């Protein structure tokens, strides 16, 4: 007899005399687990009635959202929900949504939803109330193409909750008290979950002096060792610090990881590849004495541009390491222990829209937002409160957008309940956030499946007809998301503050999409979108669209992010980012047997040519394509290359540098074959 | 008595044996044995209960090639390079041997495991081939004394090597046939050495002795297979895969015969192995001025 | 043919002769020398105190905020005097230190700017706010060597880039993490201008406690421990220490952080510690029994009041008694063992008599910790803060403005009820301009107290001089007595504060000063001198010992009009200042007839005790050989006067034992001792 | 015979000593002896000479540790996974004796490789030092089996052991010397096992049985003490440091009789070396 799920699901590591893979033992195995775990441990319930009433008066739901409907509407939207005909998709799937997502008892030995429960829940609680909303995101996030990120999936809805959004992006200034309120930034916001990333860049460098008194400064390496524990301490529970590649303490900064559990992620200027060009030296300049005689803290200055100027002023205090050998060390590094991850400052800042200077991303190098340092009286209360950055975050399945018609109504609701989790994030334990949070309307529209959906239409990864597709399609939901901006703040009647200094503002945001290249260069492109029902934007709707702008604003900031999804592709079946999958079938360290087997989407003995795995699809091609994305989305997009195990040095380093020329705006971590 | 001069060698093999046996070689606790626990709660009461007794039976086997069995075949061997292989061999043999017992703490109880091995202590057909090759090392024949350890190493250790195997095919114990899959590995070569080695003192031999050693072989073959079907309908009964076992056995007896220049006894539809247990059997720099460019 | 600098005259302070007579000369030469050869070759040489102010002002030297409350008359005048009372330097590490520490330099620090009695000046300026008489009162009582501003108040007065008044700190953590993040942030804050800092671990939730009805969660205190021990290390100058009860489940772990068996796994290195014994942890050695280590979290539930704020010696039973209050246990004896075997290699944990504490507390409330010197003992209250750290209820934390007498130059001036009386207002002074900012629980509680620590130095200086072996029958009631007659006068002056000002220390009406319960042991007889020896030494040094009359008029006075100052007095010991003061530390023994000192490019700096000639030897013993004993002995009737607490280093050889620790700490318990720094063991 | 059972294990030791003995493995291809190559040309023709005569009876020395040692050991032993460590050391030795073979080709040469080695038969105090410890393998007697042990493996050994430690506290051929420093931690839980396991045999030895050994261990490690003189004084004759190779001998040779339970011989001013050699260990 015998055959449990985790047996059946095991069975997709083994063939046939051609050379098959057994897809037949992952939708049994899923069959399976529905009936040795799930469905004798959930609990009945006559109507949905008493399943509102009793899982309120029991204190798991919270009323404070279905009392915003009608409660006749709230089972009206129920039973839609379990009739729109879900069923599951991968074994790791329903595994996933089951251990991880779904609401269980207090004890933990019953199942109390289930996923169509799941995303009611969610759309209740984005659309505020909003009758014609709430029905809008429950088809959207059932018929897979809009979905939630993990913190926001997971506790919409819950009365016993954490927070909405996880991910967090806040500089510390150069001084004992932003320093001290940082430390504790992070233990209010890695106990509620929070993945928090800092500014280092603007620190005293060592042996920089203190008080007017010489040679007295720690440097950012001590500031780090607080954070560390600030995080170890609070679980969940991961940090990450991010250093300008031009601060003098850069190689010690480096040398940290050559201070365990900590992310390293350096800013690199356009100006050190110049360096790095005729094999010459890098200059890092004191951080301190920028203060001094140019009045701006060091994280706040276009390094690449003033450079020369600032190797002239004899005040600043110029340190000299090599450029060849910087580059060299970071791959070093990352051949090793994954990051540093990269951005680069000047890449980004070029076609950045809004007013001002970025200088830092967060833990997985997707998120870029512009912010303000805060200022503190002694007794740590803010005399300035600043801007600093969190990360609302959902993403699209590339091909079940593909599929439906109204593309545009597929993006607005999308668009609409990412922003509605802005109007929600009050992170109370670090003001200059919320209150940034709260002028900025930041969000992160993500996509995913674009492997699966190349593959599925047929186009080979890296094509010259992949990144045609893959290029005309951030394109299109651009335009979607720019729109439904524009609408959202012709109806609060209010845009983003800082607006009027934005390029969507002067209008030379969309001097890009007023010019072409914008129709399809292969003819297997043009039919997808023929086929699929999406109307590519025509020049008089971006120039319709410009005047729009220039009138009413975008009520958000920032409005695209794609991260590299962590679980919730393997709920929403989706090979993972906008690149290629790490291998035919992933294997990962889960539950019981510690590993649960994930066949990528769309995938079957037949089309077997087109899933070529990551590692040999080669890193160019994932650049490439990413090149595409990097065009369209105005924040960043967390590239991950894949070298084989034998790869050296150079070929990191040569592929950073093609990265860096091709223009992408971030880089995350260089992965090895070896499982 | 000579020094070891690795440097002026007798034999091709000796080194290249001695950098394959000691590349791959192993420790217990480095796999993850206890992820297996959720597959193993799922045996039966008799399932769980045979997967012991196989380990037992697979203990004193590599038990006796470590103490009795390599050291005994030091004696034979030409080259001095030779017996620096038998030596870690013999060790090899005793990492089986732990495995096992790291297995038992793992998955299973004293409780069980005392069971199993005071059986094994009383078991008929376990401890005949346990005497069969005790006989034969102990006697002063030096071309018998391989033929007998190549069919321990080459076929004896697969009338149980089946069922972690098996189940692998199932995706059950995976982990526990991961480590398995590395004694095998082991014991493949354990085999050919052995075997080579037997094959060159045998073209050594009169032409007429040549005839006597390749009907013994099959003899005993004949009588270790004999006690291993009697063997495997013992353990196995209450399973019913006998078939695959006993078919497994024959596939697993050409395996030694090929080792020692013979040709094969049992038909492929005998020897007929279903493929997905053959298939579980086994699964810095600088930059350039120039790569600068742009 | 020439060579002696002043260092090799100082080591010359170890070398005898032939049979054994110690150089003192050569230290007294080493001084003359030290002016010769550096201090005077370095000094700025001013052509009158007229273009020196002028100098030391516009140059942004001197703080000009405290010269103007005076006509700059008065303050050329005072200057004058201060160099007209001669004073001359005692022993070369005395002067020696003062220069290189102390004193003001140029801003290059190549210069010298002050003489030691520039200094005197500054300070008794700064500290007397604008009053003539009070300013030459202190220039005086300082001078004679009456009065010594701890470190901290002497070192940064006048100069006017400066560092903090005060440091020394007592905050405490609540079970929740606003405060444990406003902890580490203190820790910072602090510790960045040199101020150590002591916390309150007693309160947070233990060892597995659940989280938001969430089971088995919390990390214990040591996450938070190392927290701050990191903190510590950052803010550099940079000590600090850490309280937790003895009945806090983590606290066999807690004690096993500074134990050898780790290294970064269950491993503090820089943080000081501090146990917290409740009389009950004795009751249950006793009976050889196990001590009942309870839930804060329980406690915190159901009695509404968190860990330290209840009783644990008086609710022992009571909480045995609560099964809702979780109970883990383990050994009384070998917890009290372990404490020895950490004592041993560590010197820590110190202790604090919960209830000795609490019991001699003559004010509201109950004292939960101590701070790094184990010497201060004053009762907080808790803080409340917003999500965004903001406070929403500043509690009170306790600062600890501390300043000190020599016991033999007090016992030399004709008034002491003068000597006191300004050492007081001097140091109220100090606690009426500790506007803390980074830390507002301990500036608005500073503000509320108006707490001050009178100490006491040159005791084994006092007693040897005046042919007194330590701890004999003359000297208990001798310094039984000393302590007497300065609480008095301390509490008069007080009093008299509380009377120009027309206010009292907040919540007076709480306090046993108010109900008169604090004069009932003063008006119960058995102050009259126990020896003839002590009552002629009082004769001798003309001091009117407080009768029964005084202690009623005092009485009616403090029950009408108050006493400006919940604490008066505490007595650390004294490290630094103890050198430029002249003082055998605090009321405790020497450390060696030639105390060596690794300060200075010798690696070596000598020392040689007040009053010690090659007549008087027998009278200077170390304090290794005198025996816990006497020392505890000596404190004891200290104790009994003074209202904060007195720092108690213990002294061992190496061939003590386990138990000698463990034994001496119950006959410090027994004879009513308050609290215990650390125990010292003999090799160098 | 009964097969292995390492879940009722017998004595604590066992295990300790197959826990890390098993731990510490290692190979000579695992360190790069590619690097002792530019630092190799800075010794003499003598220098270079004696590095190999030096690692030629240390590689004759695992040889019959290999295949005679352990062996006759394995009738002796009381725990059946006693015979298991034993059989490690058995293989452990063969590498480490490979390991000297490694050596004499990653910078030594072939005409050279030919000379020390038919020296090591043509060498009376070589020749000796091993037919003496084998005669106590090749004995019946168990307790002079594993005194051989511990002396080859704690006193015997250490006549080219010196060589590479004074080489490395200069930083020349470290990376032969960080090979040797593996090679030692073996033997130190080689020559600590065996003797911690003749300590156990003598608690069934009766009272007069005890000196019959006691004195029996003076009159064979003295006796091999004075053939190591020889072969010590020949070899480093005209280097000079054969009086610190003198107090070497006298240093593990206190902790080869530690290695059994006895009392150090050799005194503070004979035990006490280059205190440089010590500290690259
Ligand atoms: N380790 C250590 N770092 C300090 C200390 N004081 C300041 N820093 C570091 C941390 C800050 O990033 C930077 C500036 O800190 P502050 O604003 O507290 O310095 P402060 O205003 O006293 O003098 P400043 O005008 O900044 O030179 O220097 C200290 O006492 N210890
Ligand atoms: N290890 C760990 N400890 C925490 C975390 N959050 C709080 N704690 C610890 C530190 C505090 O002493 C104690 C209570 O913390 P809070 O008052 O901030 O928890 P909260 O008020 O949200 O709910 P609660 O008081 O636990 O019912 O638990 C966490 O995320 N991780
Ligand atoms: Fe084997
Ligand atoms: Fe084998
Ligand atoms: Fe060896
Ligand atoms: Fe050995
Ligand atoms: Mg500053
Ligand atoms: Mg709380």
Redesign the interface.
Same mark, same amino acid.
């Given at each position: 007899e015998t055959m449990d799920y985790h047996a059946l699901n095991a069975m997709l590591n083994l063939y046939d005399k051609a050379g098959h893979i057994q897809f037949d033992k992952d939708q049994q195995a899923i069959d399976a687990f529905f009936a040795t775990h799930v469905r004798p441990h959930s609990v009945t319930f006559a109507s949905q009635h008493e399943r509102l009433g009793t899982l309120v008066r029991e204190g798991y739901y919270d009323d404070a959202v279905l009392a915003r409907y009608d409660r006749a509407f709230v089972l009206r939207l129920f039973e839609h929900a379990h009739a729109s005909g879900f069923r599951f998709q991968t074994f790791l799937g329903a595994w996933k949504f089951y251990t991880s997502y779904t609401l269980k008892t207090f004890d933990g030995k019953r199942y109390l939803e289930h996923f169509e429960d799941r995303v009611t829940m969610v759309a209740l609680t984005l659309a505020q109330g909003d009758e014609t909303l709430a029905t809008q995101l429950t088809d959207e996030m059932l018929s897979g193409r809009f979905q939630p990120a993990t913190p926001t999936f997971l506790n919409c809805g819950k009365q016993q909750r954490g927070e909405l959004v996880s991910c967090f992006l806040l500089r510390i200034e150069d001084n004992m008290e932003s320093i001290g309120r940082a430390v504790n930034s992070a233990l209010q916001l890695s106990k509620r979950g929070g993945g928090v990333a800092f500014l280092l860049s603007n620190l005293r460098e060592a042996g920089a002096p203190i008080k007017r008194i010489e040679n007295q400064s720690s440097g950012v390496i001590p500031v780090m060792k607080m954070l560390e524990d600030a995080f170890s301490y609070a679980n969940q529970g991961a940090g990450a610090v991010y250093l300008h590649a031009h601060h003098p303490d850069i190689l010690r900064f480096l040398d940290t990881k050559r201070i365990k559990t900590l992310s390293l992620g350096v800013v690199i200027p356009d100006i050190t590849f110049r360096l790095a060009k005729e094999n010459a030296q890098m200059a890092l300049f004191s951080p301190y004495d920028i203060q001094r005689r140019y009045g701006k803290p060091f994280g706040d200055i276009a390094i690449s541009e003033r450079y020369d100027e600032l190797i002239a002023d004899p005040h600043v205090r110029k340190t000299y390491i090599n450029a060849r050998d910087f580059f060299q060390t970071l791959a070093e590094i990352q051949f090793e222990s994954g990051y540093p991850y990269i951005m680069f400052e000047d890449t980004v800042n070029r076609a950045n829209p809004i007013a001002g200077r970025i200088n830092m991303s967060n833990l997985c190098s997707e998120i870029l937002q512009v912010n303000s340092a805060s200022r503190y009286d002694d007794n740590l209360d803010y005399t300035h409160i600043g801007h600093d950055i969190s990360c609302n975050l959902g993403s699209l399945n590339i091909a079940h957008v593909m599929d439906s018609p109204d593309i545009g109504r597929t993006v607005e609701t999308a668009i609409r309940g990412l922003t509605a989790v802005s109007d929600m994030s009050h992170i109370r334990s670090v003001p200059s956030i919320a209150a940034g949070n709260a002028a900025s309307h930041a969000i992160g529209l993500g996509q995913m499946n674009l492997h699966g959906y190349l593959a599925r239409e047929g186009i080979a990864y890296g094509s010259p007809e992949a990144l045609d597709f893959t290029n005309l399609y951030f394109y299109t939901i651009t335009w979607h998301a720019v729109h439904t901006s524009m609408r959202l703040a012709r109806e609060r009647g209010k845009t983003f503050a800082g607006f009027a200094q934005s390029r969507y503002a002067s209008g030379d945001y969309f001097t890009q999409y007023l010019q072409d290249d914008w129709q399809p260069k292969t003819a297997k492109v043009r039919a997808l979108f023929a086929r699929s029902g999406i109307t590519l934007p025509t020049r008089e709707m971006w120039l319709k669209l410009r005047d729009d702008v220039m009138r009413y604003g975008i009520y958000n900031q920032n409005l695209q992010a794609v991260p590299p999804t962590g679980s919730i592709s393997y709920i929403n079946h989706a090979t993972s980012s906008i690149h290629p999958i790490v291998a035919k079938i992933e294997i990962r360290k889960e539950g019981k047997t510690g590993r649960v087997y994930y066949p990528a989407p769309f995938m079957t003995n037949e089309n077997l040519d087109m899933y070529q795995d990551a590692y040999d699809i080669g890193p160019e091609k994932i650049i490439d394509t990413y090149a595409e994305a990097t065009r369209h989305v105005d924040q960043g997009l967390s590239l991950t290359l894949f070298f084989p195990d034998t790869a050296t040095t150079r070929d990191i380093n040569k592929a950073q540098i093609y990265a860096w020329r091709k223009g992408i705006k971030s880089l995350y971590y260089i992965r090895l074959r070896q499982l | 008595?000579?020094?070891?001069?690795?440097?002026k060698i007798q034999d091709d093999k000796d080194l290249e044996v001695?950098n394959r046996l000691?590349s791959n070689?192993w420790?217990p606790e480095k796999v993850?044995l206890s992820?297996?626990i959720?597959?193993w709660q799922?045996?039966?009461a008799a399932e769980q209960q045979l997967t012991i007794r196989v380990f #037992?039976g697979l203990?004193?086997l590599? #038990?006796?090639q470590?103490?009795?069995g390599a050291?005994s075949l030091?004696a034979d061997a030409i080259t001095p390079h030779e017996?620096?292989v038998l030596?870690?061999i013999?060790?090899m043999e005793?990492?089986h041997?732990?495995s096992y017992?790291?297995i038992?703490?793992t998955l299973c109880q004293?409780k069980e495991?005392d069971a199993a091995?005071a059986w094994?202590?009383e078991n008929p057909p376990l401890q005949r081939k346990?005497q069969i090759i005790?006989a034969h090392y102990v006697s002063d024949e030096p071309l018998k004394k391989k033929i007998a350890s190549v069919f321990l190493e080459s076929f004896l250790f697969y009338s149980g090597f089946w069922l972690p195997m098996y189940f692998s095919?199932?995706?059950?114990l995976?982990?526990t046939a991961d480590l398995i899959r590395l004694i095998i590995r082991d014991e493949a070569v354990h085999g050919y050495y052995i075997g080579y080695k037997y094959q060159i003192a045998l073209q050594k031999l009169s032409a007429i002795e040549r005839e006597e050693l390749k009907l013994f072989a099959l003899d005993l073959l004949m009588e270790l297979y004999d006690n291993e079907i009697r063997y495997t309908e013992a353990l196995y009964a209450e399973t019913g895969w006998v078939n695959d076992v006993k078919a497994f056995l024959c596939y697993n007896a050409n395996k030694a015969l090929m080792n020692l220049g013979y040709e094969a006894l049992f038909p492929p539809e005998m020897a007929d192995v279903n493929?997905?247990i053959l298939?579980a059997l086994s699964p #810095?720099?600088? #930059?350039?001025?120039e790569?600068?460019?742009?």
């Open positions: - | 008595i000579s020094a070891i001069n690795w440097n001695w000691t070689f420790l993850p992820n297996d959720p597959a799922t045996l039966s #037992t203990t004193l590599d #038990t006796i470590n103490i009795a050291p030091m017996e620096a030596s870690n013999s060790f005793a990492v041997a732990r017992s790291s038992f703490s004293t495991v091995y094994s202590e346990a005790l095919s199932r995706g059950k995976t982990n493929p997905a298939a #810095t720099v600088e #930059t350039e001025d790569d600068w460019n742009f």
